[PDB]
Ligand binder design. Structure first.
Ligand SMILES: Cn1c(CNc2ccc(C(=N)N)cc2)nc2cc(C(=O)N(CCC(=O)O)c3ccccn3)ccc21
Ligand SMILES: CC(=O)N[C@@H]1[C@@H](O)[C@H](O)[C@@H](CO)O[C@H]1O
Ligand SMILES: [Mg+2]
Ligand code: NA
Lengths: 41, 251
DNA sequence: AAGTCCGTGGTAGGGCAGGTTGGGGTGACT
């Protein structure tokens, strides 16, 4: 991922956006995300 | 959410609740895209046909919430709105074209296990994920059928072919919206409902494992009717407006 | 598949640009 906005106006958060502390950060998958993944095939 | 399930704790940490102060009621969903910017639907703040017209002081936002009711100490956070920006091309009468608003928090919110922003799509994520049959995730505390739920609901819905969207409604739809939901012949069901409007339609990239908000819950004829689909605001298409508002008026 | 359409009101002012707004894409239609 690469940033698009200026943190001064946008705020913090963009660098690490869309990665959940309790799932992606822990290498745990939620109970239905697999459904999404399988739809992209 | 109709035909959904209970969200797991921390499953949608960009979920935001948009409340009216007095009398206290849940108005809409919304999403956290940074420590101080929130995305929602324009009609949540301004919709003259329902004499809906809201200023910054009328509203409250609650973040990091699982249970609709009880206060969740050291988990949820309260915030006030500094300023609201509705898209100038928002059409509240004909077709809800460009149904999007940006909302600036009066102070930055701290991130946690329960509070974390969603990514905004770029051209390539739009090109890769916006395909008929590809599924995204809708979340909210709106009605379970056409009883508002105890805890946040989640359902996964396929993006639909454009010609089907168009034939599903008399409304003159535009390139600034898309539709999602199962067809009658697919057997499966599910949809957003009243109270889910303004919440995010998210999608997980198989390329970088990140969640992207591709859509905003905008409008639908009833909820979960056969031959009807939920309409979502096309976030990527409006990303330039987002950037301009944030550049021109941020912190 | 040569191309052509996506602004002057509309959701709405003062004006024919552009602004927080008429870009370019899941392009669509012929
Ligand atoms: C339900 N809902 C909401 C908000 N909550 C919401 C609820 C459910 C869903 C959902 N079912 N996923 C998604 C959002 N706003 C709505 C505006 C109209 C409406 O304005 N029009 C005219 C303009 C236009 O909508 O084009 C329209 C459409 C068909 C007929 C007549 N009128 C109908 C329904 C609306
Ligand atoms: C259509 C509509 O009701 N919009 C008005 C808006 O023009 C006004 O600036 C705001 C604050 O008074 O209240 C509302
Ligand atoms: Mg104009
Ligand atoms: Na449906």
């Amino acid at each position: 991922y690469q940033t698009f906005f200026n943190p001064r106006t946008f705020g913090s958060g963009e660098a690490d956006c869309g990665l959940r502390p309790l799932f992606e950060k822990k290498s745990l998958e939620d109970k239905t995300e697999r459904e999404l993944l399988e739809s992209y095939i | 959410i109709v035909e959904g399930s209970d969200a797991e704790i921390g499953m949608s940490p960009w979920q935001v609740m948009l409340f009216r102060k007095s009398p206290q009621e849940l108005l809409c969903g919304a999403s956290l895209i940074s420590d101080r910017w929130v995305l929602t639907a324009a009609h949540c703040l301004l919709y003259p046909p329902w004499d809906k017209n809201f200023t910054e002081n009328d509203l409250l936002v609650r973040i990091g919430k699982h249970s609709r009711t009880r206060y969740e100490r050291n988990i949820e956070k309260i915030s006030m709105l500094e300023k609201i920006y509705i898209h100038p091309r928002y059409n509240w009468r004909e077709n809800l074209d460009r149904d999007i608003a940006l909302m600036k928090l009066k102070k930055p919110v701290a991130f946690s296990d329960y509070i974390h922003p969603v990514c905004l799509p770029d051209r390539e994520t739009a090109a890769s994920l916006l395909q008929a049959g590809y599924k995204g995730r809708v979340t909210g505390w709106g009605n379970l059928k056409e009883g508002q739920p105890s805890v946040l609901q989640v359902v996964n819905l396929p993006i639909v072919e454009r010609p089907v969207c168009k034939d599903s409604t008399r409304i003159r739809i535009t390139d600034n919206m898309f539709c999602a939901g199962y067809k009658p012949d697919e057997g499966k069901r599910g949809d957003a409902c009243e109270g889910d409007a303004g919440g995010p339609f998210v999608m997980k990239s198989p390329f970088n494992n990140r969640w992207y908000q591709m859509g905003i819950v905008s409008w639908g004829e009833g909820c979960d009717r056969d031959g009807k689909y939920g309409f979502y605001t096309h976030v990527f298409r409006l990303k330039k407006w987002i950037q301009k508002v944030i550049d021109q008026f941020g912190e």
